[PDB]
Nucleic acid binder design. Sequence first.
DNA 1: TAGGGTCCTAGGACC
DNA 2: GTCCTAGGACCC
Length: 342
Amino acid sequence: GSRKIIHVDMDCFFAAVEMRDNPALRDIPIAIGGSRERRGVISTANYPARKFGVRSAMPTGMALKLCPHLTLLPGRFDAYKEASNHIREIFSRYTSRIEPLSLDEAYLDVTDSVHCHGSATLIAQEIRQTIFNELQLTASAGVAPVKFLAKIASDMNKPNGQFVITPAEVPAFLQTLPLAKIPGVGKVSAAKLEAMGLRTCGDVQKCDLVMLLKRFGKFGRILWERSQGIDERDVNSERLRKSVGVERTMAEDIHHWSECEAIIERLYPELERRLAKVKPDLLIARQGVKLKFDDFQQTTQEHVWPRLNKADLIATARKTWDERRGGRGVRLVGLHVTLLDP
DNA sequence: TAGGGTCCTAGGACC
DNA sequence: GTCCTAGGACCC
Ligand SMILES: Cc1cn([C@H]2C[C@H](O)[C@@H](COP(=O)(O)OP(=O)(O)OP(=O)(O)O)O2)c(=O)[nH]c1=O
Ligand code: NA
């Protein structure tokens, strides 16, 4: 065998950072997200705002109809990154087996740990306490014998808490667990699963793997495994970024190539700057563009290409503009880069 | 009805 | 098989 996996997850991460750096926001409803006038969405919200129904990914117009006094912040990504680096350094104090999934969360493999008398529970507890002491931010944690159960667990005693799932507890936990709580089972999948009478891990246990493989491919094997507590994925501390993208949704749809070209001229220096931080010679594997139309269809056009080049992105966007727009208006323009393999 | 990404699928090209 | 490209589901 049994591993001890901890998933650490910061509470209301972006919003928690803003309230720490401005205590005036502590008890009023706030949210990081673009304005209604920019057609933006909520990145996240504090608990005063969540009380009204405000959620990550909600259109900002909907947020404000639910919570008219919502205070809207633009977001300070360097401040989030600074806090992320700090908590990761704190993780390193306890193990090198750290797989971060995002700025604010990480899997830890504490199986071969010596710290708190081998206790994963006490280790998770003083990570959360150390985070609070050194950053004035709170985290929740989940402790389980595999990654996905640890992740489900870190959500269950949020904010500022934790939850532990022992292998003895695993079967009762699974029996009623809704499928939609498994990472990677989203709305489309959960609706497909519901349309055949499958709601929970107990429901999936009672059905045949061969059928699940037909109907969901490799995904159906994942569902079958997870519904049994089976998650052999190792905590991997060696993953690297593979792409970088820069895209923008305009406050109004554009209808003229000249407007599209202007957008790209402003997007391109931001893409070069971010690429250079990680590859100073701008050498890349592919580059490409993205248009999202008014019928919310999205198209991408990307090709092998050795080195970030503005004119070829303009050229490609022009081809895409002409060949695939079919007269509809355009809400989004994006530039994209696929990085070399090593 | 964002912007930052990952992983998977699938057809044709190419070997 | 494996590369190329396009698109979709999903996560934070
Ligand atoms: C889900 C989500 C998160 N984010 C950002 C803001 C979040 O603070 C950060 C981490 O996401 P989460 O861990 O999903 O959410 P959270 O920290 O805000 O809330 P919770 O306490 O329930 O865990 O990433 C988005 O920008 N868009 C999204 O759709
Ligand atoms: Na979080």
